[PDB]
Amino acid sequence: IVTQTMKGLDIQKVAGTWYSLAMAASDISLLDAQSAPLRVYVEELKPTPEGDLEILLQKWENGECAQKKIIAEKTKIPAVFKIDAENKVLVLDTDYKKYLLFCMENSQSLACQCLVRTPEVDDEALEKFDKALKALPMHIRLSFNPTQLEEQCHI
Amino acid sequence: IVTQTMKGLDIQKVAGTWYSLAMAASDISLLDAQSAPLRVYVEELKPTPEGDLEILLQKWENGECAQKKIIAEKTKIPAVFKIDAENKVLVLDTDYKKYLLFCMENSQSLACQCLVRTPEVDDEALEKFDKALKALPMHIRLSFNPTQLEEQCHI
Ligand SMILES: CCCCOc1ccc(OCCCN2CCOCC2)cc1
Numbered sequence: 416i417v418t419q420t421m422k423g424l425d426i427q428k429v430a431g432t433w434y435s436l437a438m439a440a441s442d443i444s445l446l447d448a449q450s451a452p453l454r455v456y457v458e459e460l461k462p463t464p465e466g467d468l469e470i471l472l473q474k475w476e477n478g479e480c481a482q483k484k485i486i487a488e489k490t491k492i493p494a495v496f497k498i499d500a501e502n503k504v505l506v507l508d509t510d511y512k513k514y515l516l517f518c519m520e521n522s523q524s525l526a527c528q529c530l531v532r533t534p535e536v537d538d539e540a541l542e543k544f545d546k547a548l549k550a551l552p553m554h555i556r557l558s559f560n561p562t563q564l565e566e567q568c569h570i
Numbered sequence: 571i572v573t574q575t576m577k578g579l580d581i582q583k584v585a586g587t588w589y590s591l592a593m594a595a596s597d598i599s600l601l602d603a604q605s606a607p608l609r610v611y612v613e614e615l616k617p618t619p620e621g622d623l624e625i626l627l628q629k630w631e632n633g634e635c636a637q638k639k640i641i642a643e644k645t646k647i648p649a650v651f652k653i654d655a656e657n658k659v660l661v662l663d664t665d666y667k668k669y670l671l672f673c674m675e676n677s678q679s680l681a682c683q684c685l686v687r688t689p690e691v692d693d694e695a696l697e698k699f700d701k702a703l704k705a706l707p708m709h710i711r712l713s714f715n716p717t718q719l720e721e722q723c724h725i
């Protein structure tokens with residue numbers, strides 16, 4: 416369903432600190448509550464030397480903001496990785512220095528994010544995210560202010 | 571804060587059947603859950619002869635989809651009405667035959683909607699709603715498919 420990907424992705428250069436500035440999803444129920452399944456906040460991305468991608472994130476479950484770690488295994492397409500359960504991650508676009516657009520999907524369920532390096536509202540990167548999105552059937556879209564970004568689980 | 575209004579509003583011609591196709595709000599907490607305070611679905615608008623506006627809507631409270639009725643009292647500006655508690659309703663735009671854009675606000679808390687006559691996705695009217703919105707600090711946006719539109723409380 417998502418037919419936008421980044422050409423030439425250097426997976427090593429996305430390592431380190433990120434902020435989930437915005438999130439959208441095909442179904443309201445995937446992002447609606449604090450503990451919605453795809454309301455996940457990205458802390459940091461760790462690409463192994465052999466080209467896999469470890470993701471550190473945060474996730475409200477049972478009243479608490481928990482850390483989580485997950486490995487997204489590489490594929491033959493450099494902009495596409497696999498998490499196990501089945502789930503595909505796709506990198507749509509990034510300039511490495513400021514923003515990164517990604518989506519995750521199954522086999523028409525879908526959630527995408529605007530990751531940014533610093534705790535600021537980047538209008539430019541939200542435009543691009545909004546453009547990449549109009550091509551997709553989203554029904555819920557959220558965004559966070561600089562205060563919430565510095566908080567665990569964006570409270 | 572919202573500085574868009576409709577010139578020449580004929581309040582009588584908005585009477586009757588409407589569908590809340592989309593909703594946006596300044597704070598996630600105003601629309602996030604089924605029972606969020608501004609997650610209100612519009613059923614029908616009844617403009618009195620003396621220019622006031624009765625609103626029939628639906629609202630999930632305590633496990634059930636309840637009907638509600640409210641009166642929005644007129645003002646000297648024909649595109650602005652008052653509900654009592656304090657709350658201002660503003661009509662931003664409408665073509666009467668298909669769509670109506672409105673916002674409601676207090677004294678920087680804000681929620682807006684794309685109302686449409688029929689249970690269809692009107693891309694045109696969602697554009698306009700999205701344009702009217704970029705001028706505003708929204709942090710949550712939702713939209714409903716034709717099935718959910720025919721259901722009480724859009725389930
Ligand atoms: C290159 C882009 C990196 C972002 O990739 C993802 C980050 C988080 C994801 O969320 C997976 C959901 C994690 N679950 C939380 C609770 O259930 C178990 C794991 C998926 C991809």
Ligand SMILES: CCCCOc1ccc(OCCCN2CCOCC2)cc1
Pocket residue numbers: 607608610612615625627629638640653659661672674
């Ligand atoms: C001309 C546009 C008509 C839409 O106007 C409104 C429709 C619903 C509104 O919602 C008011 C919130 C209703 N509350 C629900 C639970 O608390 C008590 C009333 C406000 C304006």
